[PDB]
Structure 1
Amino acid sequence: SNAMDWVLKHTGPNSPDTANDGFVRLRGLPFGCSKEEIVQFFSGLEIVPNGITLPVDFQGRSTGEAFVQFASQEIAEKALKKHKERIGHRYIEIFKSSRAEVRTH
């Protein structure tokens, strides 16, 4: 078990029983809960640098709900429990993503 951080088998499109990978979704997110941040924020997760994208502006007005790709569910879940894990100061109420929403490439 836990090959990377908490990794499973990586047997689906990237681990089994997932939309694709490891569904995590930043929601109600404050200031710049984004690629590199999310990756190392909950250090210990196989969070892909930039399988994440906050609905932002050029300024970086992250708000509604953002995309987060985790190579396996466990990793994904360590962050699907990430409710109220701000950056800046707003309840990061993460959702169990649909990888569908998630990424943009």
Structure 2
Amino acid sequence: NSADSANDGFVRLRGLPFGCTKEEIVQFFSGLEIVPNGITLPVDPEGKITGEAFVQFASQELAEKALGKHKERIGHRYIEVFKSSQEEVRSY
């Protein structure tokens, strides 16, 4: 066993450069894969991201591989890879 509150490829990002998007999350996980339109980016009234995001990797197995990117960097800043579930990304 490796989880107790999730069983899907859903995950969460934080530490984002306030300018990262689907294209930066996917290059950050370019050694991995993500499902089509599987990324979401909450924003403020200003239309700028809250500093965190949500994704759906290819099933719960891919999400667990992406956890190796915890505290890893996107190019000049470090990122985090908390887990998630549909109940945090159902904004679809």
| Count of matched residue positions in the alignment of Structure 1 and Structure 2 | 89
Match of 2:67 among 80, 86, 104: 80
Query: What RMSD over aligned residues (CA atoms) do the two structures have, in Å?
Result: 3.0
TM-score, normalised to structure 2, is 0.66
Of the two structures, which has the highest relative contact order with CA contacts closer than 8 Å and spacing of 6 or more? 2
CA contact (8 A) 1:51 1:102 kept: no
Does residue 95 (structure 1) correspond to residue 67 (structure 2)? The answer is no
Cα 1:51–1:63 change in 2 (3 A) is same
Pick the structure with more helix per residue: 2
Q: Structure 1, residues 62-101: CA drift from partner, whole Å, max 9, x if none?
A: 3432111112122111212221233364331120112321
Unaligned runs of 5+ in 1: 1-16
Q: Residue type of the partner of 1:22?
A: G
More strand by share: 2
CA contact (8 A) 2:43 2:50 kept: yes
CA-to-aligned-CA distance 1:17-67 (integer Å, 9 cap, x gap): 874631210012224332233224322323124321222469874343211
The answer to whether the 8 Å contact 2:42/2:49 transfers is yes
- The percentage of counterpart residues that share the same residue type is 85
Unaligned regions of 5+ residues in structure 2, if any?
Answer: none
Deviation larger for 56-65 or 35-44? 56-65
TM-score w.r.t. length of structure 1: 0.60
* Pair 90,51 (structure 1): closer, same or farther in 2 beyond 3 Å: same
Q: Which residue of 1 aligns with 2:24?
A: 37
